[PDB]
Protein backbone atom coordinates (compact mmCIF):
# COMPACT_ATOMS: atom_id res chain seq x y z
CA UNK A 1 0.00 0.00 0.00
CA UNK A 2 1.26 3.48 -0.82
CA UNK A 3 1.13 6.02 2.02
CA UNK A 4 0.97 9.82 1.63
CA UNK A 5 1.80 11.84 4.71
CA UNK A 6 0.44 15.36 4.21
CA UNK A 7 1.86 18.15 6.38
CA UNK A 8 -0.12 20.93 8.09
CA UNK A 9 1.12 23.65 5.58
CA UNK A 10 0.42 21.45 2.54
CA UNK A 11 -3.37 21.55 2.59
CA UNK A 12 -3.71 21.83 -1.17
CA UNK A 13 -5.92 19.76 -3.37
CA UNK A 14 -3.17 19.88 -5.98
CA UNK A 15 -0.72 18.03 -3.77
CA UNK A 16 1.37 16.10 -6.30
CA UNK A 17 0.79 12.65 -4.68
CA UNK A 18 -2.94 13.24 -5.02
CA UNK A 19 -2.50 13.95 -8.76
CA UNK A 20 -0.26 10.86 -9.49
CA UNK A 21 -1.96 8.30 -7.15
CA UNK A 22 -5.44 9.48 -8.38
CA UNK A 23 -5.61 6.26 -10.51
CA UNK A 24 -4.48 4.23 -7.36
CA UNK A 25 -6.99 5.69 -4.92
CA UNK A 26 -8.00 2.21 -3.61
CA UNK A 27 -4.36 1.25 -2.90
CA UNK A 28 -3.36 4.43 -1.10
CA UNK A 29 -3.84 5.74 2.40
CA UNK A 30 -3.39 9.36 3.43
CA UNK A 31 -2.09 10.36 6.83
CA UNK A 32 -2.24 13.71 8.67
CA UNK A 33 -0.90 14.07 12.18
CA UNK A 34 -1.27 16.69 14.88
CA UNK A 35 1.96 16.59 17.04
CA UNK A 36 2.08 18.04 20.52
CA UNK A 37 5.86 17.81 20.56
CA UNK A 38 5.84 20.02 17.41
CA UNK A 39 3.54 22.59 19.07
CA UNK A 40 5.77 22.62 22.18
CA UNK A 41 8.75 24.01 20.16
CA UNK A 42 7.40 27.58 20.48
CA UNK A 43 4.94 29.42 22.70
CA UNK A 44 2.48 29.52 19.78
CA UNK A 45 -0.44 31.84 19.45
CA UNK A 46 -3.52 29.95 20.52
CA UNK A 47 -5.20 30.94 17.26
CA UNK A 48 -2.27 29.49 15.29
CA UNK A 49 -2.95 26.04 16.76
CA UNK A 50 -6.66 26.51 16.26
CA UNK A 51 -6.17 27.63 12.67
CA UNK A 52 -3.70 24.96 11.68
CA UNK A 53 -5.40 21.99 13.30
CA UNK A 54 -8.89 23.06 12.22
CA UNK A 55 -7.71 23.56 8.61
CA UNK A 56 -6.09 20.09 8.76
CA UNK A 57 -9.29 18.38 10.01
CA UNK A 58 -11.39 20.23 7.44
CA UNK A 59 -8.98 19.25 4.66
CA UNK A 60 -8.97 15.57 5.71
CA UNK A 61 -12.80 15.49 5.49
CA UNK A 62 -12.61 17.20 2.05
CA UNK A 63 -10.22 14.44 0.83
CA UNK A 64 -12.60 11.72 2.20
CA UNK A 65 -15.53 13.33 0.44
CA UNK A 66 -13.58 12.69 -2.78
CA UNK A 67 -13.00 8.92 -2.16
CA UNK A 68 -9.66 8.95 -0.42
CA UNK A 69 -9.02 6.79 2.68
CA UNK A 70 -7.66 9.34 5.18
CA UNK A 71 -6.38 8.50 8.66
CA UNK A 72 -6.14 11.47 10.96
CA UNK A 73 -4.21 11.22 14.20
CA UNK A 74 -5.52 13.79 16.71
CA UNK A 75 -3.30 15.22 19.46
CA UNK A 76 -0.44 12.70 18.98
CA UNK A 77 2.67 12.89 21.19
CA UNK A 78 5.06 13.01 18.23
CA UNK A 79 5.34 12.52 14.52
CA UNK A 80 7.72 9.59 15.31
CA UNK A 81 5.07 7.85 17.36
CA UNK A 82 2.07 8.52 15.08
CA UNK A 83 3.77 7.99 11.73
CA UNK A 84 5.69 4.82 12.80
CA UNK A 85 2.58 3.22 14.21
CA UNK A 86 0.47 4.00 11.14
CA UNK A 87 3.16 2.68 8.82
CA UNK A 88 3.43 -0.54 10.89
CA UNK A 89 -0.37 -0.91 11.12
CA UNK A 90 -1.23 -0.54 7.49
CA UNK A 91 1.86 -2.23 6.24
CA UNK A 92 2.82 0.83 4.27
CA UNK A 93 5.53 0.09 1.81
CA UNK A 94 6.26 3.53 0.39
CA UNK A 95 5.68 6.78 2.22
CA UNK A 96 5.34 9.70 -0.23
CA UNK A 97 6.08 13.07 1.30
CA UNK A 98 6.26 16.51 -0.35
CA UNK A 99 9.41 18.45 0.43
CA UNK A 100 8.57 20.72 3.40
CA UNK A 101 8.56 24.47 2.74
CA UNK A 102 10.53 24.81 5.98
CA UNK A 103 13.92 23.25 5.30
CA UNK A 104 14.65 22.38 8.96
CA UNK A 105 11.58 20.13 8.91
CA UNK A 106 13.17 17.81 6.33
CA UNK A 107 15.63 16.60 9.03
CA UNK A 108 12.74 15.60 11.28
CA UNK A 109 11.07 13.50 8.57
CA UNK A 110 14.22 11.88 7.29
CA UNK A 111 15.25 11.02 10.93
CA UNK A 112 12.00 9.12 11.59
CA UNK A 113 12.56 5.36 12.11
CA UNK A 114 9.92 3.68 10.00
CA UNK A 115 9.15 0.31 8.43
CA UNK A 116 8.29 2.18 5.16
CA UNK A 117 10.82 3.62 2.74
CA UNK A 118 10.66 7.39 2.07
CA UNK A 119 9.82 8.81 -1.39
CA UNK A 120 10.30 12.53 -1.67
CA UNK A 121 8.28 14.57 -4.05
CA UNK A 122 8.97 18.13 -5.03
CA UNK A 123 7.25 21.09 -3.51
CA UNK A 124 5.14 22.61 -6.13
CA UNK A 125 3.12 24.97 -3.89
CA UNK A 126 4.91 28.13 -5.02
CA UNK A 127 5.32 29.59 -8.47
CA UNK A 128 9.09 29.24 -8.78
CA UNK A 129 10.67 25.81 -8.19
CA UNK A 130 13.73 25.71 -5.95
CA UNK A 131 15.87 24.72 -8.92
CA UNK A 132 14.52 27.62 -11.02
CA UNK A 133 15.09 30.13 -8.32
CA UNK A 134 18.60 28.84 -7.79
CA UNK A 135 19.32 29.01 -11.53
CA UNK A 136 18.01 32.56 -11.77
CA UNK A 137 19.99 33.78 -8.72
CA UNK A 138 23.35 31.98 -9.27
CA UNK A 139 24.91 34.41 -11.68
CA UNK A 140 24.76 37.39 -9.29
CA UNK A 141 26.45 38.22 -5.98
CA UNK A 142 23.78 40.88 -5.23
CA UNK A 143 20.09 40.03 -5.75
CA UNK A 144 17.32 42.58 -6.19
CA UNK A 145 13.65 42.15 -5.56
CA UNK A 146 12.57 44.42 -8.44
CA UNK A 147 14.36 42.46 -11.14
CA UNK A 148 13.14 39.12 -9.79
CA UNK A 149 9.65 40.51 -9.75
CA UNK A 150 9.79 41.68 -13.43
CA UNK A 151 11.08 38.32 -14.47
CA UNK A 152 8.00 36.89 -12.67
CA UNK A 153 5.71 39.21 -14.60
CA UNK A 154 7.06 37.81 -17.82
CA UNK A 155 7.19 34.14 -16.96
CA UNK A 156 3.66 34.12 -15.72
CA UNK A 157 2.37 36.69 -18.20
CA UNK A 158 1.02 38.94 -15.46
CA UNK A 159 -0.51 42.40 -16.21
CA UNK A 160 0.99 42.66 -19.70
CA UNK A 161 -0.47 44.15 -22.87
CA UNK A 162 -0.66 42.11 -26.10
CA UNK A 163 2.71 43.58 -26.99
CA UNK A 164 4.28 42.42 -23.67
CA UNK A 165 4.50 45.91 -22.06
CA UNK A 166 3.44 46.40 -18.45
CA UNK A 167 -0.18 47.53 -18.08
CA UNK A 168 -0.47 51.20 -17.04
CA UNK A 169 2.79 52.21 -18.75
CA UNK A 170 5.37 51.19 -16.10
CA UNK A 171 6.38 48.05 -14.27
CA UNK A 172 6.10 49.29 -10.79
CA UNK A 173 3.65 51.74 -9.15
CA UNK A 174 5.10 51.57 -5.54
CA UNK A 175 6.18 55.27 -5.45
CA UNK A 176 2.43 56.12 -5.52
CA UNK A 177 1.65 53.66 -2.71
CA UNK A 178 3.04 55.59 0.31
CA UNK A 179 0.48 58.38 1.10
CA UNK A 180 0.23 58.95 4.89
CA UNK A 181 -3.20 58.27 6.47
CA UNK A 182 -6.17 60.49 5.69
CA UNK A 183 -7.84 61.97 8.88
CA UNK A 184 -11.29 60.49 9.52
CA UNK A 185 -11.26 57.83 6.75
CA UNK A 186 -12.75 54.60 7.99
CA UNK A 187 -11.30 51.34 6.72
CA UNK A 188 -13.57 48.70 5.39
CA UNK A 189 -13.98 45.77 7.67
CA UNK A 190 -12.00 42.61 7.93
CA UNK A 191 -13.61 39.36 6.76
CA UNK A 192 -14.85 37.40 9.86
CA UNK A 193 -15.98 33.77 10.10
CA UNK A 194 -17.89 32.04 12.85
CA UNK A 195 -16.26 28.82 13.97
CA UNK A 196 -18.09 25.67 12.93
CA UNK A 197 -18.27 22.47 14.94
CA UNK A 198 -14.86 21.10 13.99
CA UNK A 199 -13.25 24.43 14.78
CA UNK A 200 -15.14 24.73 18.04
CA UNK A 201 -13.82 21.32 19.09
CA UNK A 202 -10.23 22.44 18.36
CA UNK A 203 -10.76 25.68 20.31
CA UNK A 204 -11.77 23.48 23.28
CA UNK A 205 -8.77 21.24 22.71
CA UNK A 206 -6.36 24.22 22.63
CA UNK A 207 -8.07 25.71 25.67
CA UNK A 208 -7.12 22.68 27.70
CA UNK A 209 -3.51 22.22 26.58
CA UNK A 210 -0.77 22.40 29.18
CA UNK A 211 1.76 24.02 26.82
CA UNK A 212 2.86 27.58 27.38
CA UNK A 213 1.11 29.52 24.58
CA UNK A 214 0.45 33.09 23.59
CA UNK A 215 -2.44 35.50 23.13
CA UNK A 216 -6.22 35.22 23.09
CA UNK A 217 -7.93 32.00 22.10
CA UNK A 218 -11.21 33.78 21.30
CA UNK A 219 -12.85 35.35 19.46
CA UNK A 220 -11.48 33.28 16.57
CA UNK A 221 -12.71 34.66 13.28
CA UNK A 222 -10.21 33.41 10.81
CA UNK A 223 -11.01 31.42 7.57
CA UNK A 224 -10.12 27.73 8.06
CA UNK A 225 -11.34 26.17 4.83
CA UNK A 226 -10.56 26.69 1.23
CA UNK A 227 -14.06 27.95 0.65
CA UNK A 228 -13.73 30.57 3.42
CA UNK A 229 -10.29 31.57 2.21
CA UNK A 230 -11.71 32.12 -1.30
CA UNK A 231 -14.49 34.17 0.29
CA UNK A 232 -12.03 36.32 2.25
CA UNK A 233 -10.10 36.79 -1.00
CA UNK A 234 -13.18 37.76 -2.99
CA UNK A 235 -14.24 40.27 -0.44
CA UNK A 236 -10.83 41.88 -0.39
CA UNK A 237 -10.97 42.03 -4.17
CA UNK A 238 -14.46 43.61 -4.41
CA UNK A 239 -14.27 46.00 -1.44
CA UNK A 240 -10.66 46.85 -0.46
CA UNK A 241 -8.42 46.28 -3.47
CA UNK A 242 -9.52 49.70 -4.81
CA UNK A 243 -7.62 51.54 -2.08
CA UNK A 244 -4.91 49.02 -1.14
CA UNK A 245 -2.30 51.09 -2.90
CA UNK A 246 -2.65 54.57 -1.37
CA UNK A 247 -2.63 53.60 2.30
CA UNK A 248 -0.30 50.59 1.95
CA UNK A 249 2.18 52.02 4.49
CA UNK A 250 -0.34 53.92 6.65
CA UNK A 251 -0.89 53.20 10.33
CA UNK A 252 -3.91 54.32 12.30
CA UNK A 253 -4.64 54.03 16.00
CA UNK A 254 -7.51 51.57 16.62
CA UNK A 255 -7.29 50.13 13.12
CA UNK A 256 -5.86 46.63 13.02
CA UNK A 257 -6.48 45.64 9.39
CA UNK A 258 -6.98 48.75 7.24
CA UNK A 259 -7.19 47.88 3.49
CA UNK A 260 -5.07 44.67 3.80
CA UNK A 261 -6.36 41.24 2.50
CA UNK A 262 -5.46 39.09 5.51
CA UNK A 263 -5.02 35.98 3.33
CA UNK A 264 -1.38 35.19 4.26
CA UNK A 265 -2.26 32.69 6.93
CA UNK A 266 -4.53 30.87 4.41
CA UNK A 267 -1.96 31.05 1.59
CA UNK A 268 0.70 29.76 3.92
CA UNK A 269 -1.35 26.68 4.91
CA UNK A 270 -1.90 25.80 1.24
CA UNK A 271 -5.60 26.59 1.17
CA UNK A 272 -4.96 29.11 -1.58
CA UNK A 273 -2.39 28.97 -4.32
CA UNK A 274 -0.35 32.05 -5.12
CA UNK A 275 -1.14 31.88 -8.88
CA UNK A 276 -4.84 31.73 -8.38
CA UNK A 277 -4.56 34.74 -6.12
CA UNK A 278 -2.67 36.61 -8.82
CA UNK A 279 -5.06 35.58 -11.65
CA UNK A 280 -8.09 36.64 -9.69
CA UNK A 281 -6.40 39.97 -8.91
CA UNK A 282 -5.89 40.56 -12.61
CA UNK A 283 -9.41 39.58 -13.44
CA UNK A 284 -10.54 42.06 -10.88
CA UNK A 285 -8.58 44.75 -12.75
CA UNK A 286 -10.18 43.70 -16.07
CA UNK A 287 -13.59 43.89 -14.33
CA UNK A 288 -12.98 47.56 -13.37
CA UNK A 289 -12.69 46.80 -9.66
CA UNK A 290 -9.50 48.73 -8.81
CA UNK A 291 -6.89 51.08 -10.27
CA UNK A 292 -3.81 49.52 -11.74
CA UNK A 293 -1.53 51.00 -9.03
CA UNK A 294 -3.34 49.06 -6.27
CA UNK A 295 -3.70 46.07 -8.57
CA UNK A 296 -0.05 45.91 -9.37
CA UNK A 297 0.72 46.78 -5.77
CA UNK A 298 -1.06 43.74 -4.46
CA UNK A 299 0.33 41.37 -7.07
CA UNK A 300 3.93 42.47 -6.32
CA UNK A 301 3.52 41.35 -2.77
CA UNK A 302 2.82 37.77 -3.96
CA UNK A 303 4.61 37.46 -7.33
CA UNK A 304 7.55 39.46 -5.92
CA UNK A 305 8.02 39.53 -2.18
CA UNK A 306 6.43 36.21 -1.21
CA UNK A 307 8.18 34.23 -3.95
CA UNK A 308 11.37 36.03 -3.14
CA UNK A 309 11.31 34.97 0.49
CA UNK A 310 10.54 31.33 -0.21
CA UNK A 311 13.36 31.20 -2.83
CA UNK A 312 15.89 32.83 -0.49
CA UNK A 313 15.07 30.55 2.36
CA UNK A 314 16.24 27.59 0.19
CA UNK A 315 18.91 29.55 -1.75
CA UNK A 316 20.72 30.95 1.26
CA UNK A 317 22.95 28.67 3.35
CA UNK A 318 21.24 26.64 5.99
CA UNK A 319 23.20 28.65 8.66
CA UNK A 320 21.47 31.91 7.57
CA UNK A 321 19.41 31.73 10.76
CA UNK A 322 22.56 32.56 12.73
CA UNK A 323 23.12 35.87 10.84
CA UNK A 324 23.99 38.67 13.30
CA UNK A 325 25.86 41.38 11.37
CA UNK A 326 25.37 44.01 14.07
CA UNK A 327 26.35 41.61 16.86
CA UNK A 328 23.16 42.50 18.72
CA UNK A 329 22.45 40.32 21.66
CA UNK A 330 19.94 42.03 24.04
CA UNK A 331 16.90 39.98 25.15
CA UNK A 332 13.42 41.06 24.12
CA UNK A 333 11.74 43.32 26.62
CA UNK A 334 8.99 41.50 28.48
CA UNK A 335 6.54 43.93 26.78
CA UNK A 336 6.82 41.92 23.56
CA UNK A 337 5.07 39.11 25.49
CA UNK A 338 2.72 41.07 27.81
CA UNK A 339 2.06 44.13 25.56
CA UNK A 340 2.61 46.42 28.57
CA UNK A 341 4.36 49.49 27.21
CA UNK A 342 3.48 53.17 27.02
CA UNK A 343 5.15 53.50 23.61
CA UNK A 344 1.84 53.92 21.88
CA UNK A 345 2.95 52.63 18.46
CA UNK A 346 4.25 49.40 20.02
CA UNK A 347 1.25 49.01 22.34
CA UNK A 348 -1.14 49.20 19.41
CA UNK A 349 0.76 46.46 17.56
CA UNK A 350 1.02 44.15 20.59
CA UNK A 351 -2.62 44.69 21.37
CA UNK A 352 -3.77 43.44 17.93
CA UNK A 353 -1.18 40.63 17.79
CA UNK A 354 -2.44 39.39 21.16
CA UNK A 355 -6.02 39.62 19.98
CA UNK A 356 -5.85 38.21 16.40
CA UNK A 357 -2.25 37.03 15.74
CA UNK A 358 -1.77 39.67 13.11
CA UNK A 359 -0.03 42.97 12.46
CA UNK A 360 0.20 44.43 8.96
CA UNK A 361 3.36 44.73 6.98
CA UNK A 362 4.40 48.29 7.84
CA UNK A 363 3.84 47.50 11.53
CA UNK A 364 6.08 44.48 11.25
CA UNK A 365 8.84 46.47 9.57
CA UNK A 366 8.72 50.13 10.71
CA UNK A 367 7.41 49.73 14.24
CA UNK A 368 8.39 46.24 15.49
CA UNK A 369 11.49 45.25 13.50
CA UNK A 370 12.68 48.86 13.44
CA UNK A 371 12.45 49.01 17.25
CA UNK A 372 14.23 45.66 17.54
CA UNK A 373 17.05 46.84 15.30
CA UNK A 374 17.63 50.22 16.99
CA UNK A 375 17.29 48.71 20.45
CA UNK A 376 20.02 46.17 19.77
CA UNK A 377 17.95 43.12 20.25
CA UNK A 378 18.95 39.54 19.65
CA UNK A 379 17.78 38.83 16.02
CA UNK A 380 17.12 35.17 16.77
CA UNK A 381 14.88 36.12 19.68
CA UNK A 382 12.96 38.66 17.61
CA UNK A 383 12.57 36.13 14.84
CA UNK A 384 11.26 33.51 17.24
CA UNK A 385 8.85 35.93 18.83
CA UNK A 386 7.37 36.77 15.36
CA UNK A 387 7.22 33.06 14.60
CA UNK A 388 5.25 32.27 17.80
CA UNK A 389 2.86 35.17 17.62
CA UNK A 390 1.78 35.57 13.96
CA UNK A 391 -0.66 33.19 12.28
CA UNK A 392 1.13 33.37 8.88
CA UNK A 393 4.49 32.44 10.43
CA UNK A 394 6.81 29.70 9.29
CA UNK A 395 10.59 29.55 8.92
CA UNK A 396 10.71 30.29 5.24
CA UNK A 397 8.94 33.55 5.63
CA UNK A 398 10.15 34.59 9.06
CA UNK A 399 13.92 33.90 8.71
CA UNK A 400 13.94 35.96 5.54
CA UNK A 401 11.56 38.79 6.55
CA UNK A 402 13.03 39.31 10.03
CA UNK A 403 16.74 38.68 9.50
CA UNK A 404 16.82 40.03 5.99
CA UNK A 405 14.30 42.84 5.72
CA UNK A 406 13.50 43.93 9.28
CA UNK A 407 16.89 43.66 11.00
CA UNK A 408 19.53 43.74 8.26
CA UNK A 409 21.11 40.93 10.35
CA UNK A 410 22.54 39.34 7.21
CA UNK A 411 24.34 42.61 6.33
CA UNK A 412 22.22 43.39 3.25
CA UNK A 413 22.06 40.13 1.29
CA UNK A 414 18.31 40.55 1.02
CA UNK A 415 17.85 44.27 1.39
CA UNK A 416 19.45 47.41 0.12
CA UNK A 417 19.67 49.26 3.31
CA UNK A 418 18.63 49.12 6.94
CA UNK A 419 15.03 50.25 7.36
CA UNK A 420 15.90 51.73 10.75
CA UNK A 421 14.17 55.00 11.52
CA UNK A 422 13.57 57.55 14.23
CA UNK A 423 10.15 58.87 15.24
CA UNK A 424 10.21 61.19 12.19
CA UNK A 425 8.98 58.28 10.13
CA UNK A 426 6.42 56.97 12.54
CA UNK A 427 4.89 60.46 13.26
CA UNK A 428 4.60 61.11 9.49
CA UNK A 429 3.14 57.77 8.42
CA UNK A 430 0.86 57.23 11.42
CA UNK A 431 -1.32 59.09 13.91
CA UNK A 432 0.12 57.08 16.85
CA UNK A 433 2.33 59.88 18.35
CA UNK A 434 -0.77 62.08 18.92
CA UNK A 435 -2.21 59.59 21.41
CA UNK A 436 1.33 58.89 23.00
CA UNK A 437 2.78 60.10 26.23
CA UNK A 438 6.18 60.64 24.54
CA UNK A 439 7.12 63.45 22.20
CA UNK A 440 8.43 62.40 18.81
CA UNK A 441 10.15 65.83 18.46
CA UNK A 442 12.29 65.29 21.62
CA UNK A 443 15.39 63.15 21.95
CA UNK A 444 16.51 63.68 25.61
CA UNK A 445 14.69 63.45 28.91
CA UNK A 446 11.74 61.43 30.27
CA UNK A 447 9.27 62.72 27.67
CA UNK A 448 11.39 61.96 24.53
CA UNK A 449 10.28 59.21 22.18
CA UNK A 450 12.76 56.38 22.89
CA UNK A 451 13.06 55.69 19.13
CA UNK A 452 15.01 58.94 18.81
CA UNK A 453 17.86 58.25 21.23
CA UNK A 454 17.99 54.60 20.14
CA UNK A 455 18.16 55.43 16.35
CA UNK A 456 20.92 58.01 16.79
CA UNK A 457 22.89 55.81 19.24
CA UNK A 458 22.36 53.01 16.72
CA UNK A 459 24.02 55.07 14.00
CA UNK A 460 26.86 56.10 16.30
CA UNK A 461 27.60 52.58 17.41
CA UNK A 462 27.66 51.12 13.87
CA UNK A 463 28.92 54.23 12.09
CA UNK A 464 31.95 52.48 10.61
CA UNK A 465 30.20 49.41 9.21
CA UNK A 466 27.33 51.53 7.94
CA UNK A 467 29.78 53.86 6.23
CA UNK A 468 31.54 51.04 4.38
CA UNK A 469 28.29 49.70 2.85
CA UNK A 470 27.77 53.11 1.26
CA UNK A 471 24.01 53.43 0.96
CA UNK A 472 23.59 55.66 4.07
CA UNK A 473 25.78 58.65 3.15
CA UNK A 474 23.12 61.31 3.77
CA UNK A 475 21.93 59.90 7.06
CA UNK A 476 25.56 59.54 8.24
CA UNK A 477 26.34 63.15 7.33
CA UNK A 478 23.54 64.03 9.79
CA UNK A 479 25.21 61.92 12.47
CA UNK A 480 28.47 63.68 11.54
CA UNK A 481 27.00 67.08 12.48
CA UNK A 482 26.67 65.99 16.12
CA UNK A 483 29.58 66.92 18.42
CA UNK A 484 30.97 64.28 20.81
CA UNK A 485 29.23 65.93 23.76
CA UNK A 486 25.84 65.61 21.93
CA UNK A 487 26.43 61.95 20.98
CA UNK A 488 27.55 61.22 24.54
CA UNK A 489 24.25 62.55 25.77
CA UNK A 490 22.36 60.51 23.20
CA UNK A 491 24.21 57.38 24.38
CA UNK A 492 23.35 58.08 28.00
CA UNK A 493 19.74 58.55 26.94
CA UNK A 494 19.73 55.28 24.94
CA UNK A 495 21.37 53.52 27.93
CA UNK A 496 18.59 54.81 30.19
CA UNK A 497 15.69 53.47 28.06
CA UNK A 498 17.38 50.09 27.77
CA UNK A 499 17.63 49.79 31.48
CA UNK A 500 14.07 50.93 32.02
CA UNK A 501 12.12 48.75 29.60
Binding residues for ligand HDF, rule: CB under 6 A, are 7-9, 33-35, 38-39, 44, 48, 52, 100-102, 105, 394
- Which one of residues 145, 388, 420, 449 is an interface residue with ligand SF4 (CB under 6 A)? 449
By CB under 6 A, residue 191 contacts ligand SF4: no
Interface region with ligand SF4, contact rule CB under 6 A, candidates 111-119, 236-244, 293-301, 343-351: 343-351
Residue whose CB is less far from ligand SF4, 232 or 256: 256
CB of residue 443 to ligand HDF, shortest distance in Å? 40
DSSP state of 255: -
* CB of 51 or CB of 60, closer to ligand FAD: 51
Judged by beta carbon, residue 270 or residue 376, the one nearer ligand HDF is: 270
Peptide bond into 341 cis (omega under 30): no
Minimum CB separation from ligand HDF for residue 489, in Å? 44
CB under 5 to 8 A by kind: which of ligand SF4, ligand HDF, ligand FAD, none does 438 bind?
A: ligand SF4
Contact 423, 449 (CB under 8 A): yes
Helix/strand/coil for 338: helix
Smallest gap from Cβ 429 to ligand SF4, in A, equals 10
Q: How far is the CB of 309 from ligand FAD (least distance, A)?
A: 4
Which is closer to ligand FAD, CB of 5 or CB of 380? 380
d(CA 381, CA 337): 12
Cβ-based neighbours of 452, under 8 Å, separated by 6 or more: 422, 423, 440, 442, 443
- Contact residues toward ligand FAD (CB under 6 A) are 260-264, 267-268, 301-302, 305-306, 309, 360-361, 364-365, 369, 386, 390, 392-393, 397-398, 401-402, 405-406
Residue 426 interacts with ligand SF4 (CB under 6 A): yes or no: yes
Task: Return the exposure string of 225-258: e unless at least 16 CB atoms fall within 10 Å of the residue's CB, then b.
Answer: bbebbbebbebbbeebbbbbbbbbbbbbbebbbb
Select the binding partner of residue 145 from ligand FAD, ligand SF4, ligand HDF, none (C-beta < 5 to 8 A, by kind): none
* Residue list for the binding site for [4Fe-4S] cluster: 345, 433, 436, 449
Binder among 49, 203, 343, 356 for ligand SF4 (CB under 6 A)? 343
Residue 412 CA to residue 408 CA, distance in Å, equals 6
Helix axis angle for 307-315 and 130-137, nearest 10°, is 80
Give buried/exposed letters for 57-72 (b at 16+ CB in 10 A, else e): bbbbebbeeeebebeb
Q: Which of 57, 226, 260, 344 binds ligand SF4 (CB under 6 A)?
A: 344
Q: Quick count: other Cβ atoms within 10 Å of Cβ 95?
A: 22
The distance of closest approach from Cβ of residue 18 to ligand SF4 in the complex, given in angstroms and rounded to an integer, is 48
Does residue 494 interact with ligand SF4 by CB under 6 A?
Answer: no
Determine, following the binding rule CB under 6 A, whether residue 432 of this chain makes contact with ligand SF4: yes
Q: If phi over 0 gives left and psi between -120 and 50 gives alpha, with beta otherwise, what is residue 142? A: beta
Does residue 98 bind ligand SF4 (CB under 6 A)? no
Q: Which is nearer to ligand SF4, 294 or 452 (CB)?
A: 452
User: What is the SS3 assignment for 95?
Assistant: strand
Tell which phi-psi region holds residue 141, choosing left (phi > 0), alpha (psi between -120 and 50) or beta: alpha
CB of 336 to ligand FAD, least distance (A): 13
Q: Which is nearer to ligand FAD, 92 or 393 (CB)?
A: 393
Closer to ligand SF4 by CB, 263 or 459: give it: 459
By beta-carbon proximity to ligand SF4, the closer residue of 251 and 403 is 251
Q: How far apart are CA 36 and CA 391, in angstroms?
A: 17
Non-local CB neighbours of 189 within 8 Å, separated by 6+ positions: 257
Query: Could you tell me which stretch among 134-142, 156-164, 391-399, 433-441 binds ligand SF4 (CB under 6 A)?
Result: 433-441
Residue 369 lies near ligand SF4 (rule: CB under 6 A): no
Q: What DSSP string describes 194-248?
A: ---HHHHHHHHHHHT--S--BS---S-----SHHHHHHHHHHIIIIIGGGTTTTT
With beta carbons less than 8 A apart as the criterion, state whether 213 and 206 touch.
yes
Give the span between the Cα atoms of 362 and 385, in whole angstroms: 17
427 binds, among ligand HDF, ligand SF4, ligand FAD, none (CB under 5 to 8 A by kind): ligand SF4
Q: Which is nearer to ligand SF4, 22 or 495 (CB)?
A: 495
CB distance 294 to 177 below 8 Å? yes
Amino acid sequence: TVGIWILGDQLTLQHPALSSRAVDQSQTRILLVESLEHAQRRPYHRQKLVLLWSAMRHFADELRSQGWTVDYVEQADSFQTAVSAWCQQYQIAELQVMEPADRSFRAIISSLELTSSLHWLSNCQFLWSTAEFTAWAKPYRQLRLENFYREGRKRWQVLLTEDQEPIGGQWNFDPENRKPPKTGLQPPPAAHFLPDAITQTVIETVRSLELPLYGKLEPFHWPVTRSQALEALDQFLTVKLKTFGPYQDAMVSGQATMWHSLIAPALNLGLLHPLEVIRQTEQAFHNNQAPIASVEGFIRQILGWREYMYGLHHYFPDTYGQSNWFEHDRPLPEFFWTGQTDLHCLQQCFQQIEAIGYSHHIQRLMILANFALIAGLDPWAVKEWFQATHLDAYDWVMETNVLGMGLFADGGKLASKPYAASANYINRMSNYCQNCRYDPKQRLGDRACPFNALYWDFLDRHEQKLQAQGRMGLILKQLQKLPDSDRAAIRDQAAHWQASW
